[PDB]
Design a protein around this ligand. Sequence first.
Ligand SMILES: Nc1ncnc2c1ncn2[C@@H]1O[C@H](COP(=O)(O)OP(=O)(O)O)[C@@H](O)[C@H]1O
Ligand SMILES: Nc1ncnc2c1ncn2[C@@H]1O[C@H](COP(=O)(O)OP(=O)(O)O)[C@@H](O)[C@H]1O
Ligand SMILES: [Mg+2]
Ligand SMILES: [Mg+2]
Lengths: 205, 207
Amino acid sequence: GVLIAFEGIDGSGKSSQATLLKDWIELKRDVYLTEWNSDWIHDIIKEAKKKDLLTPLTFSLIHATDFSDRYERYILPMLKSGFIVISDRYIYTAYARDSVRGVDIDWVKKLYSFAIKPDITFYIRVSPDIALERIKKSKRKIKPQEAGADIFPGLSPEEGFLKYQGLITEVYDKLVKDENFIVIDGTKTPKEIQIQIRKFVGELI
Amino acid sequence: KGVLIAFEGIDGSGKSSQATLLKDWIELKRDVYLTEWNSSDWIHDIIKEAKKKDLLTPLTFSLIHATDFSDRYERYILPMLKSGFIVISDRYIYTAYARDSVRGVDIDWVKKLYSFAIKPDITFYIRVSPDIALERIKKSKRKIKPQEAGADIFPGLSPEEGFLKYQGLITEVYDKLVKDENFIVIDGTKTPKEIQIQIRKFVGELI
Ligand SMILES: Nc1ncnc2c1ncn2[C@@H]1O[C@H](COP(=O)(O)OP(=O)(O)O)[C@@H](O)[C@H]1O
Ligand SMILES: Nc1ncnc2c1ncn2[C@@H]1O[C@H](COP(=O)(O)OP(=O)(O)O)[C@@H](O)[C@H]1O
Ligand SMILES: [Mg+2]
Ligand SMILES: [Mg+2]
């Protein structure tokens, strides 16, 4: 059982490369792909608390709660069954998104220590500037979570994305050495990068 | 200036009875606010939808209660200790230590989880046997909640038999925390008034 994690700023190419790589493993091996889509516990609590301003701390516990249920209901059982699990975003998303709002990152690390470290974590390194260009063409609505609208209320969605995804990057780069991140340069072509992905993974043998 | 006073003990040991008697005394001299460990209704909606697809692990339940506590802690508890109040917490984080470690969650990880929370200025551990506590809820005519009986970890037992063994394991965790958490051990066998006058002696000296 091997767990491979993708992380990087939003619009950095995470899911697009995650789905092409699940199309590759699926021909040869058991593979299961997950995104942080969050799940039902985040939905209940957010709706119940739509009126109040909750603290980053409480937001942090809500996401970890919802992740803990996916982790022990799907992720961990499939790694016990031998599957490869591809996580489109893993616990290092929570490290950044909650530590950037003043939650003690070492407390977040302890919070998530119930989770196995990925066999490999692909850090797709892309500038916020270059990555913002792609969501403009995709016709997507720019979610407030993506712009850090809670932290940057005065800015426009566009302007908030640039500043928020920047501090996200600093936390990611801070994790590179301690977390054995492998940094992939997301500047490149989807396929060009994709063949870098398939080489690194294959090494497992 | 703000002071936080905690009661801990198994269910039916008298915590709420002594917390409210102590609130009747403190409010004569100072601003005091009494808080309980009551869950928000979104938890009961979590358990409802859970009972429909699959069972959540003790770990997720532990994170659910810490989430529910963190919000109450930072919306009511922490501002009022910052405002100088006395806060009486009928149950506090050591209930979470006990309830989560007896279901196999690493107690040292739970300590890290709740480490955002201030440690009580005083913690009264109201110690009574499961035998004695079960005797009183039977006199109280009240129904023994499955959570009180550990129904999730001891299904099949009767409420009485489940209460007895479950609160025994809760007692073991409380007894294990006494020294490191500087518990004030109260012999809850005694009288409500005798206990309460012992309690007001301890509190007055502190404040
Ligand atoms: N390397 C790339 N170059 C150009 N466009 C891309 C690249 N990767 C993804 N896209 C496009 O940009 C958008 C970002 O998609 P996606 O990778 O799902 O973002 P996320 O990383 O948030 O999941 C998509 O509309 C996709 O079609
Ligand atoms: N010191 C005491 N001695 C005898 N009975 C008590 C004492 N304190 C409380 N009781 C009774 O025993 C029960 C325990 O109630 P409570 O204070 O709600 O326990 P807890 O909050 O610890 O569950 C209540 O029915 C109460 O009437
Ligand atoms: Mg995505
Ligand atoms: Mg009580």
